[PDB]
């Protein structure tokens, strides 16, 4: 989880104290129009994988991020 949360923290330009299990990228973490797509690409690299379009679409908050890799 903390791995994901460091990536979400680094991309979105936030401090780890703001990455809440509840937090939505756009609403809570000031994600712009390219932010989540670039964040999903970031999780693609440090998790040596590939996220399908039917699924990344459902990755808009850190719970949805963590709950998918798990």
């Amino acid at each position: 989880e903390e791995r994901v949360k460091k990536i979400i923290g680094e991309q979105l330009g936030v401090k780890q104290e703001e990455v809440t299990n509840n937090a939505s990228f756009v609403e809570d973490l000031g994600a712009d129009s390219l932010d989540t797509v670039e964040l999903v690409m970031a999780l693609e690299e440090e998790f040596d994988t590939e996220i399908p379009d039917e699924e990344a679409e459902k990755i808009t908050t850190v719970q949805a991020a963590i709950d998918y890799i798990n």
């Binding site: 129009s33 390219l34 797509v37 670039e38 690409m41």
Partner: protein
Amino acid sequence: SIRLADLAQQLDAELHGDGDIVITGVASMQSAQTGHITFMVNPKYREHLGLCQASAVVMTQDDLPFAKSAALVVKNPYLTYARMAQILDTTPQPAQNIAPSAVIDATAKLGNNVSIGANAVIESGVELGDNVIIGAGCFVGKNSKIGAGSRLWANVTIYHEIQIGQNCLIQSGTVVGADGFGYANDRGNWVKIPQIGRVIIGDRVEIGACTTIDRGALDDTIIGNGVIIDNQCQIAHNVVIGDNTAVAGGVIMAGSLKIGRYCMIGGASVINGHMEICDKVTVTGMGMVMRPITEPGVYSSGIPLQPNKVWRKTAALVMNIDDMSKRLKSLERKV
């Protein structure tokens, strides 16, 4: 108003139908009523002729069988349309006679049949050729010269020492001869470079509205004969535009650009300065002209619209295209 036979003769058209039909104006095919002449270029409209209410239609020999009215047969209907629209033009003049409210310097030279609109301001040393018309509220700066037959609509600003040729037309809001964007940098402070070049506009130049043509720094900004420039364009200092070139709306040219003859610059293109574009170049809309163009032809740039969802991906993949290159190459190394 004109007789169809008389109009056809001025147009070098073959008249097929009643020469005595009275023509009162031009109209679109769909709006045309009795008394109106219209035109047709695209053969797909042939079917539409049967529901057209125009007294006459300008068309080609091939279209003639499909005609349901008097027809003017010509080789080039669009061009004939332009000519007939000129004959039947209802556009007023920007001014008639010399308005009492106009402020004209005593050293201004006026030719014959000059008309100047209300509240126009003509500076010292100005020369207005025969039949020049200056619209209401215009300013024409010191020692500027406007050639015979040229017309400015309302609220045009011409700076000092500007030369405009004959039979030109400039629409309202346009500014010709303002200072070019010349500054030297002195430890982060901008030091103004006075712009003492001029603008030279040739004959039969037509310039649209809210267009800005800056004067040169030392030598001149030059607009060749027969050039057409649309609205909202920016023509920087020392730009040279060749004869018969067309510049569409919202084009931004940078300093010392040289454009050849017979070019077509599409709307909202952005053109780098201190370089040359040769004759007969077409740049399509929104062109990013960064490099000199040495060969004639059609040039383009830009990625068109996509649904916002799709675009987001497209944009992110492009900004990361270098990584995408490295991985393509290592995957080649591997195999």
